[PDB]
Protein backbone atom coordinates (compact mmCIF):
# COMPACT_ATOMS: atom_id res chain seq x y z
CA UNK A 1 0.00 0.00 0.00
CA UNK A 2 1.09 3.50 -0.90
CA UNK A 3 1.40 6.20 1.77
CA UNK A 4 -1.15 8.98 2.18
CA UNK A 5 0.82 12.23 2.03
CA UNK A 6 -0.39 14.60 4.76
CA UNK A 7 1.75 17.65 3.87
CA UNK A 8 4.47 18.35 1.31
CA UNK A 9 6.80 20.93 -0.22
Amino acid at each position, epitope marked *: *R*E*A*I*V*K*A*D*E
Partner: antibody
Amino acid sequence: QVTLKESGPGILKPSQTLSLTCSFSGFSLSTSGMGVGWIRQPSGKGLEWLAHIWWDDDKYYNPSLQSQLTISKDTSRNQVFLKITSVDTADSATYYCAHDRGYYAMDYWGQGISVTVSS
Amino acid sequence: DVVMTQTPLSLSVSLGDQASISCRSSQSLVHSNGNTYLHWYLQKPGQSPKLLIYKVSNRFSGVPDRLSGSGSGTDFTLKISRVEAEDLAVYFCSQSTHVPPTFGGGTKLELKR
Protein backbone atom coordinates in the same frame (compact mmCIF):
# COMPACT_ATOMS: atom_id res chain seq x y z
CA GLN B 1 13.82 25.67 17.50
CA VAL B 2 11.85 22.40 17.40
CA THR B 3 12.67 20.01 20.26
CA LEU B 4 11.08 16.72 21.42
CA LYS B 5 11.62 14.56 24.51
CA GLU B 6 10.32 11.05 25.28
CA SER B 7 9.34 9.89 28.77
CA GLY B 8 8.23 6.53 30.21
CA PRO B 9 9.59 3.56 32.18
CA GLY B 10 13.09 2.20 31.58
CA ILE B 11 11.87 -1.33 32.31
CA LEU B 12 8.60 -3.30 32.41
CA LYS B 13 7.50 -6.97 32.33
CA PRO B 14 6.27 -9.08 29.43
CA SER B 15 2.47 -8.91 29.01
CA GLN B 16 2.33 -5.41 30.53
CA THR B 17 1.29 -2.24 28.75
CA LEU B 18 3.97 0.27 27.73
CA SER B 19 2.94 3.94 28.12
CA LEU B 20 5.15 6.53 26.45
CA THR B 21 4.79 10.31 26.30
CA CYS B 22 6.35 12.74 23.84
CA SER B 23 6.65 16.35 25.03
CA PHE B 24 7.55 18.93 22.39
CA SER B 25 8.15 22.66 21.81
CA GLY B 26 8.91 24.95 18.87
CA PHE B 27 5.77 23.81 17.08
CA SER B 28 2.10 23.12 17.79
CA LEU B 29 -0.13 20.24 16.68
CA SER B 30 -2.77 22.93 16.10
CA THR B 31 -0.73 24.14 13.11
CA SER B 32 -1.78 22.74 9.73
CA GLY B 33 0.68 20.23 8.25
CA MET B 34 2.20 19.23 11.63
CA GLY B 35 2.71 15.58 12.60
CA VAL B 36 4.54 13.56 15.23
CA GLY B 37 5.83 10.02 14.74
CA TRP B 38 7.06 7.16 16.90
CA ILE B 39 9.91 4.99 15.66
CA ARG B 40 11.89 2.36 17.62
CA GLN B 41 15.30 0.73 17.35
CA PRO B 42 16.28 -2.47 19.18
CA SER B 43 19.92 -2.37 20.34
CA GLY B 44 22.26 -2.86 17.36
CA LYS B 45 19.29 -3.31 14.99
CA GLY B 46 17.31 -1.32 12.39
CA LEU B 47 14.64 1.32 12.80
CA GLU B 48 11.00 0.25 12.81
CA TRP B 49 8.12 2.68 12.29
CA LEU B 50 5.34 2.47 14.85
CA ALA B 51 2.77 5.25 14.33
CA HIS B 52 2.09 8.88 13.35
CA ILE B 53 -0.60 11.31 14.46
CA TRP B 54 -1.45 14.51 12.59
CA TRP B 55 -2.77 17.98 13.34
CA ASP B 56 -6.20 17.01 11.94
CA ASP B 57 -6.52 13.93 14.22
CA ASP B 58 -5.54 11.53 11.40
CA LYS B 59 -3.58 8.53 12.76
CA TYR B 60 -1.58 5.86 10.96
CA TYR B 61 -0.15 2.60 12.25
CA ASN B 62 2.42 0.02 11.22
CA PRO B 63 0.04 -2.65 9.82
CA SER B 64 1.94 -5.59 11.37
CA LEU B 65 1.74 -3.97 14.88
CA GLN B 66 -1.59 -2.14 14.84
CA SER B 67 -3.44 -4.50 17.24
CA GLN B 68 -0.89 -3.47 19.91
CA LEU B 69 -0.62 0.25 19.18
CA THR B 70 -2.64 3.29 20.24
CA ILE B 71 -1.48 6.82 19.44
CA SER B 72 -3.15 9.95 20.86
CA LYS B 73 -2.38 13.60 21.58
CA ASP B 74 -3.01 16.50 23.92
CA THR B 75 -2.55 19.47 21.62
CA SER B 76 -3.16 21.95 24.45
CA ARG B 77 -0.14 20.64 26.38
CA ASN B 78 2.02 19.79 23.35
CA GLN B 79 2.11 16.09 24.12
CA VAL B 80 1.68 12.93 22.07
CA PHE B 81 1.09 9.51 23.61
CA LEU B 82 1.85 5.96 22.59
CA LYS B 83 0.51 2.84 24.22
CA ILE B 84 1.80 -0.63 23.39
CA THR B 85 -0.16 -3.55 24.86
CA SER B 86 1.16 -7.10 25.55
CA VAL B 87 4.87 -6.26 25.35
CA ASP B 88 7.52 -8.99 25.20
CA THR B 89 11.34 -8.95 24.92
CA ALA B 90 11.21 -8.18 21.17
CA ASP B 91 9.78 -4.82 22.26
CA SER B 92 13.01 -3.93 24.08
CA ALA B 93 14.35 -0.89 22.16
CA THR B 94 15.13 2.78 22.14
CA TYR B 95 11.87 4.58 21.35
CA TYR B 96 11.97 7.91 19.50
CA CYS B 97 9.30 10.51 18.93
CA ALA B 98 9.87 12.76 15.89
CA HIS B 99 8.57 15.84 14.06
CA ASP B 100 7.47 14.93 10.53
CA ARG B 101 7.75 16.82 7.24
CA GLY B 102 4.36 15.54 6.07
CA TYR B 103 5.34 12.39 4.21
CA TYR B 104 7.15 10.20 6.79
CA ALA B 105 10.53 11.82 6.71
CA MET B 106 11.39 12.92 10.22
CA ASP B 107 13.44 16.10 10.52
CA TYR B 108 13.67 16.56 14.30
CA TRP B 109 14.04 13.65 16.72
CA GLY B 110 13.91 13.26 20.47
CA GLN B 111 16.98 11.93 22.29
CA GLY B 112 15.18 8.57 22.55
CA ILE B 113 14.10 6.61 25.61
CA SER B 114 15.55 3.17 26.35
CA VAL B 115 12.85 0.63 27.20
CA THR B 116 13.75 -2.89 28.35
CA VAL B 117 11.11 -5.61 28.53
CA SER B 118 12.32 -8.05 31.18
CA SER B 119 11.43 -9.95 34.33
CA ASP C 1 7.21 -4.18 2.86
CA VAL C 2 9.59 -2.53 0.38
CA VAL C 3 13.21 -3.62 0.91
CA MET C 4 16.03 -1.06 0.74
CA THR C 5 19.33 -2.73 -0.24
CA GLN C 6 22.16 -0.46 0.75
CA THR C 7 25.79 -0.86 -0.36
CA PRO C 8 28.53 -0.96 0.76
CA LEU C 9 28.29 -2.09 4.40
CA SER C 10 31.41 -0.17 5.46
CA LEU C 11 33.48 2.58 3.93
CA SER C 12 37.00 3.65 4.94
CA VAL C 13 38.23 6.74 3.09
CA SER C 14 41.24 9.08 3.25
CA LEU C 15 40.55 12.56 4.65
CA GLY C 16 39.19 14.87 1.92
CA ASP C 17 38.20 11.96 -0.34
CA GLN C 18 34.66 11.32 -1.61
CA ALA C 19 32.38 8.64 -0.17
CA SER C 20 29.56 7.22 -2.26
CA ILE C 21 26.66 5.13 -0.95
CA SER C 22 24.06 3.32 -3.07
CA CYS C 23 20.47 2.36 -2.21
CA ARG C 24 18.28 0.14 -4.42
CA SER C 25 14.56 -0.41 -3.68
CA SER C 26 12.62 -3.64 -4.35
CA GLN C 27 10.07 -1.53 -6.26
CA SER C 28 9.74 1.97 -7.72
CA LEU C 29 9.69 4.78 -5.17
CA VAL C 30 7.70 7.02 -7.53
CA HIS C 31 4.41 7.72 -5.72
CA SER C 32 1.21 7.81 -7.78
CA ASN C 33 1.28 11.61 -7.19
CA GLY C 34 4.56 11.70 -9.18
CA ASN C 35 6.90 12.55 -6.29
CA THR C 36 9.69 10.31 -5.00
CA TYR C 37 9.80 9.81 -1.25
CA LEU C 38 13.37 8.72 -0.61
CA HIS C 39 15.47 10.22 2.19
CA TRP C 40 18.92 9.98 3.76
CA TYR C 41 19.83 9.94 7.41
CA LEU C 42 22.87 9.45 9.58
CA GLN C 43 23.22 8.16 13.12
CA LYS C 44 26.20 8.48 15.43
CA PRO C 45 26.55 6.05 18.37
CA GLY C 46 24.47 6.93 21.45
CA GLN C 47 22.62 9.49 19.32
CA SER C 48 19.27 9.84 17.56
CA PRO C 49 19.12 9.75 13.76
CA LYS C 50 19.58 13.06 11.89
CA LEU C 51 17.88 13.91 8.60
CA LEU C 52 20.33 14.78 5.84
CA ILE C 53 18.36 14.68 2.60
CA TYR C 54 14.63 14.48 1.94
CA LYS C 55 12.87 13.61 -1.30
CA VAL C 56 16.03 12.47 -3.15
CA SER C 57 18.07 15.69 -3.28
CA ASN C 58 16.83 18.32 -0.80
CA ARG C 59 19.34 19.12 1.93
CA PHE C 60 17.91 19.62 5.41
CA SER C 61 18.86 22.91 7.11
CA GLY C 62 22.45 22.91 8.41
CA VAL C 63 23.55 20.15 6.03
CA PRO C 64 26.62 21.37 4.02
CA ASP C 65 26.35 21.23 0.20
CA ARG C 66 29.28 18.81 0.51
CA LEU C 67 26.57 16.13 0.80
CA SER C 68 24.35 15.48 -2.22
CA GLY C 69 21.67 12.98 -3.23
CA SER C 70 20.52 11.78 -6.63
CA GLY C 71 18.75 8.93 -8.40
CA SER C 72 15.32 7.93 -9.63
CA GLY C 73 12.93 4.98 -9.75
CA THR C 74 14.66 2.23 -7.76
CA ASP C 75 18.28 3.47 -7.80
CA PHE C 76 19.63 6.20 -5.49
CA THR C 77 23.02 7.52 -4.39
CA LEU C 78 24.31 9.65 -1.51
CA LYS C 79 27.68 11.34 -2.15
CA ILE C 80 29.79 12.89 0.60
CA SER C 81 32.61 15.08 -0.72
CA ARG C 82 35.62 16.07 1.41
CA VAL C 83 35.00 13.45 4.10
CA GLU C 84 36.13 14.82 7.47
CA ALA C 85 36.31 13.39 11.00
CA GLU C 86 32.88 14.86 11.90
CA ASP C 87 31.26 12.80 9.12
CA LEU C 88 31.89 9.57 11.08
CA ALA C 89 28.47 7.91 11.38
CA VAL C 90 26.24 5.12 10.06
CA TYR C 91 24.41 6.43 6.97
CA PHE C 92 21.14 4.97 5.69
CA CYS C 93 18.42 5.55 3.11
CA SER C 94 14.69 5.45 3.84
CA GLN C 95 11.67 5.09 1.56
CA SER C 96 8.27 6.40 2.64
CA THR C 97 6.43 6.07 -0.67
CA HIS C 98 5.01 2.79 0.66
CA VAL C 99 3.67 1.68 4.03
CA PRO C 100 5.47 1.03 6.28
CA PRO C 101 8.42 3.38 5.77
CA THR C 102 11.51 1.18 5.54
CA PHE C 103 15.24 1.77 5.95
CA GLY C 104 18.55 0.75 4.39
CA GLY C 105 20.78 -1.59 6.41
CA GLY C 106 23.32 1.22 6.91
CA THR C 107 26.85 2.15 5.77
CA LYS C 108 29.46 2.73 8.48
CA LEU C 109 31.71 5.60 7.45
CA GLU C 110 35.26 5.50 8.81
CA LEU C 111 38.25 7.73 8.12
CA LYS C 112 41.95 7.10 7.52
CA ARG C 113 44.58 8.70 9.73
